[PDB]
Amino acid sequence: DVPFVQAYSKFADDNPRHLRVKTGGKMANALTNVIRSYYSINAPAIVPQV
């Protein structure tokens, strides 16, 4: 499972755990909110630039 551990660690900035759901970490949250902003001007811009 080393190739998946390395890939997920870079993507999610955290090591995968057996009993925890693999969600994608900060990158998943940033991508989800950024998609929301593109669709509508009414959607807020939550993600910081940093």
Partner 1 sequence: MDVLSKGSLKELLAHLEKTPLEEAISYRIGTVPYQNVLISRNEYYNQLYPDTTSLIDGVSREGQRNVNGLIMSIISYVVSGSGHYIPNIGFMLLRRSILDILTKHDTGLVTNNLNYGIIARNLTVSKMNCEQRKRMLICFKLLAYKDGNQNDYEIYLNQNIPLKQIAPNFIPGDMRTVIHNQDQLAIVGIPAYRLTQSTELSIRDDNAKSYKLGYVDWYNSNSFLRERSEFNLIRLKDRDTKYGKLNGW
Partner 2 sequence: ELIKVPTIPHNLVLIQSDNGKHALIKEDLGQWPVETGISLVNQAGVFAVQLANKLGIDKPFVLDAGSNYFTDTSFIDTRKYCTDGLSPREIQKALNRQRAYYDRPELTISENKTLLSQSIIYPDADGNDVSIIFSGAMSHAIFTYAQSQWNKNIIKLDDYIREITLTVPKQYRPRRFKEIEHTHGYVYRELNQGSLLPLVDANLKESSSYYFKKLMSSISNVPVDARTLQSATAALAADTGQAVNRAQHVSMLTNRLTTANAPTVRAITVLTCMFKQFRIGMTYALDPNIMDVAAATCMLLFRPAQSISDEQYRYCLQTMAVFLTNTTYDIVNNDTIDVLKMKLRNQGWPFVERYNAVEIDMSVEPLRSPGQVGRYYNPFNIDPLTKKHVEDRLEEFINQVQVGRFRNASGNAVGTTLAAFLRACRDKTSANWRGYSVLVSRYRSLIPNELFESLRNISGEYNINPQDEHSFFFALAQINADDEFIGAIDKESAEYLDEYATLARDISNSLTLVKAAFGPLERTSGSIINHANNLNKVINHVFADKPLISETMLKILTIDGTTGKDGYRNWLDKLVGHNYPVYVEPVVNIMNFISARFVADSSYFGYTNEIMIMPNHINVPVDDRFGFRDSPFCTSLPRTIMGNDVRRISYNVFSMMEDIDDVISEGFILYDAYFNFSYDIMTTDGVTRLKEDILIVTDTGNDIKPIHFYIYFENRNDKKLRYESKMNVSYRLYIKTPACLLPLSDYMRAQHDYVSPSSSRVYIKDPAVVYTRS
Of 2, 19, 21, 41, which one interacts with partner 2 (CB under 8 A)? 2
29 scored as a contact of partner 2 (CB under 8 A): no
DSSP secondary structure of 9-32 = HHHHSS---TTS----HHHHHHHH
3 versus 48: smaller Cβ distance to partner 1: 48
39 scored as a contact of partner 1 (CB under 8 A): no
From first CA to last CA, the distance across the chain in angstroms is 32
Q: How far is the CB of 10 from partner 2 (least distance, A)?
A: 9
46 scored as a contact of partner 2 (CB under 8 A): no
- φ/ψ of residue 43, rounded to 5: -70, 140
